[PDB]
Design a binder for this molecule. Structure first.
Ligand code: CLA
Ligand code: CLA
Ligand code: CLA
Ligand code: CLA
Ligand code: CLA
Ligand code: CLA
Ligand code: CLA
Ligand code: CLA
Ligand SMILES: CCCCCCCCCCCCCCCCCC(=O)OC[C@H](CO[C@@H]1O[C@H](CO)[C@H](O)[C@H](O)[C@H]1O)OC(=O)CCCCCCCCCCCCCCCCC
Ligand SMILES: CCCCCCCCCCCCCCCC(=O)OC[C@H](COP(=O)(O)OC[C@@H](O)CO)OC(=O)CCCCCCCCCCCCCCC
Ligand code: SF4
Ligand code: FES
Lengths: 97, 88, 157, 31, 143, 80, 42, 743
């Protein structure tokens, strides 16, 4: 259900609660910890990030490498947090390489 | 290294691979003859207008005065004609 | 050892070297032909051209045309080859007319196979192309005439 | 003296000849 | 403001065997392109025209016939290898032209010394009808 | 040379610049979006007109547009 | 077994069964009342 | 190093949960549908194994079990054939009088008047005359009762269940690992010596003990029920020694090396059996013996586990010279890591083999009473030509797939491939030229001929009467094949076929089995047409393969895949640059070439081969012999072949051949229906679907899986599929109706 989320960020690391049927981005939108986005549609790399633990539902994710979902990177705006997760933010370019 | 800003043609390959640049092998008595007699046909407009009108001349001529052994279209029919399905 | 090499050691020009394009026999032969006799008067080369090609174009029009068996008209079908010579020399003339202008240098390459400068081949002029045209045409019609002159029985008339 | 004997050839052979050389020289001309 | 590098000829070229896909007459009379890169070691890579070549350790200098060839080769070099490349346009005059990257940075990263070319400040649904521009040589998207 | 135009609905995702095969496009600074970014098209004399950029744009409707126009040697993609 | 009940309701199987039954029904009707051009009843 | 069995236990678990979740194999399909496009993709990528995953082991496991599934299906189809021969056929009566009863193994129920399709095929039976030639096989096998057909149907059903179980087993319980598959030396040793050697040895055995004696009895005139059962011939041997004295010494010669004493039933005769119009069975048994010996020896070439043998890598590395650099070094690494390279080579060879089978089976008829059954001969030649062409085109498809997805000079470099890639321009230039020249000098002759025949100038034609173009080499070769038996083949009596010549003609039941086929100007023209069509098909397919990765027009084509619509309308327009589109275009040209091949064979056989012979010995051919003089113009093909022979099919309404009349028209319809998909594009269709969707929305009846128009590539594929089906089915109906009607 509404597992706790953990996001490392240059601002720090903060937690907010939010049901599994949601995308991470609107839920960091709720409590008010600002994150970088451009598209909100899963077709760019501004909302990119990687994981510390658990793993996130990436069913409705697209425009990604047939690997970007098997070695860590995730787009925060099309992602369902199946577990109590611990994630990274501002991770576009070390993804952009 | 095959890039030299000074000489561009060698870098982009403007060689003549089969040209010779050797002297003439047609000794002058033979060349003499030809470049004397074959000169008047060496102007562009001259040659073109002459060729066109002379070819047309020969064609109209040989077309208007060709004999029957040549062209069945000239020998005409040699038979009585049939009647059509009703008419004729 | 290998036989095919890039053209003059440059492996980024769009071609190769083989025993077909760069071979001593082929090189010497292709060099001694009229089109590749750069340092010769255009008209002489054209003369060789027209001679050979009128003589060659005699045969087929004679031995295959509509009157091949009618010989009150079989041999005199050299009229056809004369007409073909006329037509493709008209084509030569319009090609030269459109491709060149006298007040411009000749587009031929100035470098040779080893990297020395050459005086650009003058056949690629406007002037010299008209000269070569006249030569080819003169040769073509009189070569038609020559191979019609040899009507004497040989092996296959 | 046969009238088609002259008109059919030149409209069929030389008219297109002169017109094709004409239009070629015109269409490949940079003014 | 980012002087661009110079073209250093005598820069060696990769080890190629020759192919029928290289330069043609257009490079003699109109233009051609030149790419240069670094290559920490000698390695094999797929030519953007034919088979495979060996890039030499140290600077590398290739001559191609289209900007798209240079850019496809550069994309391959930049992602699969970690290599920096630049390419240039050479005219039959003997004149070079540094081409890419233009201002020193790659265009997918925003640099503060760039002006806007071809930007309309409205949505695409707010172009006039063609009847508004008839008989005058502009186009509805020109505005 | 074709025409390429950028419209103010752009969200500055850069996906169009990454896709161009001839390096026509560029990102420039802006103030009208969260990314403070906008696309520009400074080098349209090299555009082959593939519309690879339009397939990449996510806005509805498009924010980059390619209008095919007069053809040249570079525009046709001729190597000879 | 439940998964089988679901699978049997996927589109191609459902349509296959529906039309095979319909075909049997029309075939038997025409085997009983052959060569009908009109409604001969009322 | 050494060779062994290597297997994993229980890799995947048998379950139904994945049946209820459509598109489990691909992550994109698994997510589920938003639009109808999903439903299409689900089927298009179903067997693209190496795209569902990256692991070679998984792809090979899937391929192995898929092969087992295919074999199970084939066994079920064979089971059906034998059961229908046993249960709904007139095979016994045909066995009694083969040259009057026309074979039939399918009857129809009387439902809507369709029982008219149960026609009088002779023998007190009414059904559909079959053309697969199964009765001829069953007679050449020795089968004489329907109980044997029942038995083989049951055995085939058992074998099909066995194949299906093995397919499940090797995927879910005992799945072999990659090193097992990648052992090609032991595989070749087994297929050469075990599958093909032991197979033809066992079959030669069956022919020596069953087919030969039962056919001897049948040709002697004995009633097919009073012939002993085959096993009697094995229990009591005096039965065999009565027909072949050599069976008294019984394997003493085979050891005493006096093989001469077997000349009884192992012969080298050549020619046909003048009683049944087929090859001598005593020749076929001896042939199979020899082939088995050859294969059993050839299956001992490659080293597996005992030193002796040949290393394939060593053979390939040994071959190289001054024109090819290092060639063949690096092909063993390639041919063992890509399934697509293997599939391309295999498809090429199997297609060529099928075409060769077509030719050899018409020219030297193997089965008894097949040569005079004209419908079966036409059917078999045509069927096998079509199969061969299709397989050859698939070969190109998978060579292109290898070039796009697998070729990699960074980790697997081969020299020959690299050099061909480095002069592809000259290659395609010369092939283009030769196809243009070949097209001018073959079809151009036909156009010259039509124009000379319409201009009242037949003395200016290209024909046997005016301007002769005799194929001197073909005539010279068949003359050498005529004089062969006795001069360059002293051990032969008659020559290999009756088409070579020698003045020998074979007849059966008052019909012509075979006679010498005459070559003339028309044969010369037709063969050069054939060379033209094959060269064009090759040009298209090889251009598709060689430029699958990059071009001067699109320099990074490999990054767009193997099957993509285009790269946009720029650069002038780049529709159909992909290699898939080259395969799509090559299918039309294969259709063209094979169609002309089967038309040439069909007209030539009726005109100069088939017919009826009289007791006085005057042969009347089906068509009058008009191929020599009417085949040389196009008008003669339209008039004397199409218009004159379509009469049988356009007059079948009311007879038992009326199904062919219905299929003629249906096939024309399907062909014309494909042009709609081939001539249009999907933008128009999506915009029309917009308005239809509006109308549905107006009534709260609009679907949730949003309807889309088909893909660009799907449009092309639907188009070519319906085009091929329509055309081939039209020719199918025409041929079968025509050949069945006259005879
Ligand atoms: C539409 C007008 C037209 C006309 C009037 C002709 C007329 C003729 N054609 Mg022709 N043809 C045409 C169109 C035409 N064709 C087209 C469009 C095609 C393409 C399909 C052909 C293809 C064709 C072929 C393949 C052949 C002919 C041949 C012939 C000649 C056959 C009769 C003959 O034996 O003459 C008498 C025999 C002669 C040799 C007369 C030669 C004509 C003079 C002497 C040539 C002088 C030319 C002159 C210097 C300049 C050339 C033209 C100039 C006025 C611009 C005849 C003069 C046949 C032929 O004879 O070949 C030559 C033949 O082989 N035609
Ligand atoms: C558009 C009307 C027309 C058409 C379709 C034809 C068609 C034909 N004419 Mg005819 N002709 C016409 C008008 C026409 N003519 C007129 C008004 C005259 C003068 C009264 C003639 C005098 C004429 C003669 C003497 C002969 C023909 C002949 C022929 C036939 C041979 C082809 C040929 O040589 O061309 C026609 C050749 C000509 C010299 C016609 C010249 C006069 C017309 C007006 C030329 C028009 C050209 C014009 C600039 C282009 C108009 C544009 C458009 C037609 C494309 C051909 C079927 C020949 C024949 O009978 O073949 C057996 C023949 O020798 N024509
Ligand atoms: C729009 C096209 C069309 C139409 C209007 C018809 C109409 C008809 N067809 Mg036909 N048919 C067609 C296309 C068409 N067909 C095509 C394309 C084919 C080729 C595949 C055929 C092949 C075909 C055959 C072989 C036969 C027919 C027959 C018939 C008649 C059947 C009457 C019947 O079924 O009894 C009554 C059926 C019912 C009353 C069913 C309704 C009862 C429901 C289920 C119960 C509801 C209770 C509340 C009927 C007049 C039959 C016939 O008798 O011809 C004279 C027949 O033999 N058709
Ligand atoms: C590729 C193989 C093949 C093909 C194309 C056919 C084709 C045909 N068979 Mg046949 N058959 C086959 C294999 C095949 N069979 C095998 C392997 C056997 C057992 C050895 C049989 C035994 C058989 C019998 C006994 C009969 C046929 C009949 C028929 C004809 C009517 C079709 C029918 O079944 O009625 C209607 C179709 C149905 C009722 C639906 C079939 C559903 C059944 C239950 C099995 C399919 C279930 C599936 C596994 C799920 C038809 C032309 C019938 C016939 O000839 O009539 C005169 C007939 O009675 N077949
Ligand atoms: C004498 C040994 C032998 C024989 C007879 C065969 C025979 C066959 N192999 Mg095989 N193979 C062998 C050894 C052998 N193999 C070895 C040693 C290896 C590598 C270790 C392989 C690896 C291999 C692969 C990868 C594939 C084959 C395939 C095939 C089939 C090819 C298609 C065909 O022609 O079908 C002809 C059909 C018949 C002849 C019908 C009769 C079928 C009989 C019963 C086959 C039984 C032979 C088999 C070896 C029995 C062992 C099983 C046993 C433990 C119970 C064929 C039946 C293909 C396949 O598996 O298709 C499923 C294929 O993909 N083989
Ligand atoms: C794998 C094929 C095959 C098989 C299974 C058999 C099986 C058999 N053959 Mg044989 N045979 C074969 C091929 C085969 N043959 C071939 C190719 C030839 C030609 C050289 C012969 C020629 C031959 C002779 C001459 C004899 C047999 C005989 C026999 C039977 C003797 C029983 C025995 O000792 O074993 C036996 C059932 C003997 C026999 O007829 O027993 C009834 C007998 O004398 N065979
Ligand atoms: C041993 C033979 C063989 C094998 C194992 C394969 C295997 C494969 N092929 Mg291939 N191919 C072959 C032969 C073979 N092919 C031949 C002979 C050709 C020439 C036509 C091709 C041309 C070809 C192309 C162009 C492509 C493949 C592709 C593929 C891959 C995916 C196929 C797929 O699942 O699509 C799904 C299968 C279907 C959707 C079924 C299609 C149904 C057809 C169109 C209907 C046929 C009508 C039917 C015969 C009669 C009408 C019945 C009706 C009236 C009811 C796969 C690995 C694809 C690929 O991407 O490779 C990676 C690819 O695009 N093949
Ligand atoms: C070049 C054309 C040619 C061809 C295709 C053949 C073909 C054949 N010859 Mg032959 N032969 C030829 C020329 C030819 N011959 C000539 C010019 C002469 C001298 C006049 C002979 C003399 C000759 C004799 C005496 C015999 C044959 C036999 C045979 C048959 C068995 C082949 C064989 O022994 O396996 C090949 C044997 C090998 C050891 C493999 C060697 C591979 C070759 C040499 C390469 C075979 C069909 C035999 C026969 O009659 O069969 C019944 C036989 O008795 N030939
Ligand atoms: C055909 C019979 C199908 C029976 C079936 O689907 O359910 C029967 C079960 C599905 O039933 C499942 O069974 C599992 C353990 O067997 C678990 O207990 C699940 O809870 C149970 O739902 O599937 C099978 O066992 C059939 C395997 C293949 C048979 C062919
Ligand atoms: C076969 C005929 C071709 C002769 C190849 C002669 C031959 O085998 O050459 C041999 C040569 C390579 O031989 P090597 O000495 O390198 O051999 C060492 C390695 O091959 C070891 O396997 O190949 C070439 O020369 C390049 C191929 C270009 C060939 C151009 C010919 C193009 C078409 C010719 C076909 C026209 C007739 C076909 C009618 C069927
Ligand atoms: S969308 Fe269609 S018409 Fe346009 S370029 Fe692609 S294939 Fe051609
Ligand atoms: S905004 Fe770019 S992925 Fe969410």
């Amino acid at each position: 259900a509404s597992y706790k989320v953990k996001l490392v960020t240059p601002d720090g690391t903060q937690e907010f609660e939010c049901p599994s049927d949601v995308y991470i981005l609107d839920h960091a939108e709720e409590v008010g910890i600002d994150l970088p986005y451009s598209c909100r549609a899963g077709s760019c790399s501004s909302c990119a990030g990687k994981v510390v633990g658990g793993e996130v539902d990436q069913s409705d994710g697209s425009f990604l490498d047939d690997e970007q979902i098997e070695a860590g990177f995730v787009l925060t705006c099309v992602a369902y947090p199946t577990s109590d997760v611990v994630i990274e933010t501002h991770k576009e370019e070390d993804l952009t390489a | 290294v095959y890039f030299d800003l000074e000489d561009l043609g060698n870098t982009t390959g403007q060689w003549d691979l089969y040209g010779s640049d050797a002297p003439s092998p047609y000794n002058s008595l033979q060349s003499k003859f030809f470049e004397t007699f074959a000169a008047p046909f060496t102007k562009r407009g001259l040659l073109l207008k002459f060729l066109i009108l002379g070819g047309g001349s020969t064609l109209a001529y040989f077309s208007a005065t060709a004999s029957g052994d040549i062209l069945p279209i000239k020998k005409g029919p040699q038979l009585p004609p049939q009647l059509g399905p009703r008419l004729g | 050892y290998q036989v095919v090499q890039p053209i003059n050691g440059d492996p980024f020009i769009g071609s190769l070297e083989t025993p077909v394009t760069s071979s001593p026999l082929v090189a010497w032969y292709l060099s001694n032909l009229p089109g590749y006799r750069t340092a010769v008067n255009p008209l002489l080369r054209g003369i060789e051209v027209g001679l050979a090609h009128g003589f060659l174009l005699v045969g087929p029009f004679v031995k295959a045309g509509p009157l091949r068996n009618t010989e009150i008209a079989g041999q005199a079908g050299s009229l056809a080859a004369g007409g073909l010579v006329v037509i493709l020399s008209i084509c030569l003339t319009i090609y030269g007319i459109s491709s060149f202008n006298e007040g411009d240098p000749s587009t031929a390459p100035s470098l040779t196979l080893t990297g020395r400068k050459k005086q650009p081949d003058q056949l690629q002029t406007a002037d010299g192309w008209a000269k070569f045209t006249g030569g080819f045409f003169f040769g073509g019609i009189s070569g038609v005439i020559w191979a019609f002159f040899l009507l004497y029985v040989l092996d296959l008339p | 003296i046969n009238l088609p004997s002259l008109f059919v050839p030149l409209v069929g052979l030389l008219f297109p000849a002169v017109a094709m050389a004409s239009l070629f020289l015109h269409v490949e001309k940079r003014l | 403001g980012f002087t661009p590098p110079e073209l250093d000829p005598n820069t060696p070229s990769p080890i190629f065997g020759g192919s029928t896909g290289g330069l043609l007459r257009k490079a003699q009379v109109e233009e051609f392109y030149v790419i240069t890169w670094e290559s920490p070691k000698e390695q094999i890579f797929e030519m953007p025209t034919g088979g495979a070549a060996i890039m030499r350790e140290g600077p590398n200098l290739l001559k191609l016939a289209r900007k798209e060839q240079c850019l496809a080769l550069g994309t391959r070099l930049r992602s699969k290898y970690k290599i920096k490349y630049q390419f240039y346009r050479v005219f039959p005059s003997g004149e070079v032209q540094y081409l890419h990257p233009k201002d020193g940075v790659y265009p997918e990263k925003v640099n503060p010394g760039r002006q806007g070319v071809g930007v309309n400040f409205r949505s695409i649904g707010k172009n006039v009808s063609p009847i508004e521009v008839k008989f005058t040589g502009k186009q509805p998207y020109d505005l | 040379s074709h025409s390429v135009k950028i419209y103010d609905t752009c969200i500055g995702c850069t996906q169009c610049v990454r896709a161009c095969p001839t390096d026509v496009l560029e990102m420039i600074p802006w103030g009208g979006c969260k990314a403070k970014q906008i696309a520009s098209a400074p080098r349209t004399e090299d555009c082959v007109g593939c519309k690879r950029c339009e397939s990449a744009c996510p806005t509805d409707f498009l924010s980059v547009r390619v209008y095919l126009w007069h053809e040249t040697t570079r525009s046709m993609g001729l190597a000879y | 077994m439940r998964d089988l009940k679901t699978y049997l309701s996927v589109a191609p199987v459902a349509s296959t069964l529906w039309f095979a039954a319909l075909a049997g029904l029309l075939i038997e009707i025409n085997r009983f009342f052959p060569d009908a051009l009109t409604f001969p009843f009322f | 190093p050494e060779v062994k069995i290597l297997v994993d236990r229980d890799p995947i678990k048998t379950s139904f949960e994945q049946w209820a979740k459509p598109g489990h194999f691909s992550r994109t399909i698994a997510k589920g549908p938003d639009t109808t496009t999903w439903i299409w993709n689900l089927h298009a990528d179903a067997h693209d194994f190496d795209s569902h995953t990256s692991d070679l082991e998984e792809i090979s496991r899937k391929v192995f079990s898929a092969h087992f599934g295919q074999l199970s299906i084939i066994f079920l189809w064979l089971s059906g054939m034998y059961f229908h021969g046993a249960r709904f056929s007139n095979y016994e009566a045909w066995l009694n009088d083969p040259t009057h009863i026309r074979p039939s193994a399918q009857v129809v129920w009387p439902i809507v008047g369709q029982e008219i399709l149960n026609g009088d095929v002779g023998g007190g039976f009414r059904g559909i005359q079959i053309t697969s030639g199964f009765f001829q096989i069953w007679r050449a096998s020795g089968i004489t009762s329907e109980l044997q057909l029942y038995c083989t149907a049951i055995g085939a059903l058992v074998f099909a269940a066995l194949m299906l179980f093995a397919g499940w087993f090797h995927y879910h319980k005992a799945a072999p690992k990659l090193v097992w598959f990648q052992d090609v030396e032991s595989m070749l040793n087994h297929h050469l010596a075990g599958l093909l050697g032991l197979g033809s040895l066992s079959w030669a055995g069956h022919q020596v003990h069953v087919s030969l004696p039962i056919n001897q009895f049948l040709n002697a005139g004995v009633d097919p029920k009073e012939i002993p059962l085959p096993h009697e011939f094995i229990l009591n041997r005096d039965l065999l020694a009565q027909l072949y004295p050599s069976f008294a010494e019984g394997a003493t010669p085979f050891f005493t090396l006096n093989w001469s004493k077997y000349a009884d039933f192992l012969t080298f005769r050549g020619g046909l059996d003048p009683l049944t119009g087929g090859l001598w069975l005593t020749d076929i048994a001896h042939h199979h013996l020899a082939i088995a010996i050859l294969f059993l020896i050839a299956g001992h070439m490659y080293r597996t586990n005992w030193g002796i043998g040949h290393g394939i890598k060593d053979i390939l590395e040994a071959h190289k010279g001054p024109f090819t650099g290092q060639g063949h070094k690096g092909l063993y690494e390639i041919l063992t890591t890509s399934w697509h390279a293997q599939l391309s080579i295999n498809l090429a060879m199997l297609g060529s083999l099928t075409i060769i089978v077509a030719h050899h089976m018409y020219a030297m008829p193997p089965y008894p009473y097949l040569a005079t059954d004209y419908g079966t001969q036409l059917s078999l030649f045509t069927h096998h030509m079509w199969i061969g062409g299709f397989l050859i085109v698939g070969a190109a498809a998978h060579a292109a797939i290898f070039m796009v997805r697998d070729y990699d000079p960074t980790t697997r470099y081969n020299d020959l491939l690299d050099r061909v890639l480095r002069h592809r321009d000259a290659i395609i230039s010369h092939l283009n030229w030769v196809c243009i020249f070949l097209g001018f000098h073959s079809f151009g002759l036909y156009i010259h001929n039509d124009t000379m025949s319409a201009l009242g100038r037949p003395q200016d034609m290209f024909s046997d009467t005016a301007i002769q173009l005799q194929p001197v080499f073909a005539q010279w070769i068949q003359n050498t094949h005529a004089l062969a038996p006795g001069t360059t083949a002293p051990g032969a009596t008659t020559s290999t076929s009756l088409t070579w010549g020698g003045g020998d003609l074979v007849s059966v039941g008052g019909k012509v089995a075979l006679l010498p086929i005459p070559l003339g100007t028309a044969d010369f023209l037709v063969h050069h047409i054939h060379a033209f069509t094959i060269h064009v098909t090759v040009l298209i397919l090889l251009k598709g393969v060689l430029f699958a990765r990059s071009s001067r027009l699109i320099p990074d084509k490999a990054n767009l895949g193997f099957r993509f619509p285009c790269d946009g309308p720029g650069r002038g327009g780049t529709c159909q640059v992909s290699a898939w589109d080259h395969v799509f275009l090559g299918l039309f040209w294969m259709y063209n070439a094979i169609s002309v091949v089967i038309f040439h064979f069909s007209w030539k056989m009726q005109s100069d081969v088939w017919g009826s012979i009289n007791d006085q010995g005057v042969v009347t051919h089906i068509t009058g012999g008009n191929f020599a003089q009417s085949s040389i113009t196009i008008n003669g093909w339209l008039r004397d072949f199409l218009w004159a022979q379509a009469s049988q099919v356009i007059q079948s309404y009311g007879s038992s051949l009326s199904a062919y009349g219905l299929f003629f028209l249906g096939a024309h319809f399907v062909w014309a229906f494909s042009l709609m998909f081939l001539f249009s594009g999907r933008g128009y269709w999506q915009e029309l679907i917009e308005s239809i969707v509006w109308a549905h929305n107006k009534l709260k009846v609009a679907p949730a899986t949003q309807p889309r128009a088909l893909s660009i590539v799907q449009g092309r594929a639907v188009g070519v599929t319906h085009y091929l089906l329509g055309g081939i089915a039209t020719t199918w109906a025409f041929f079968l109706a025509r050949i069945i009607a006259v005879g």
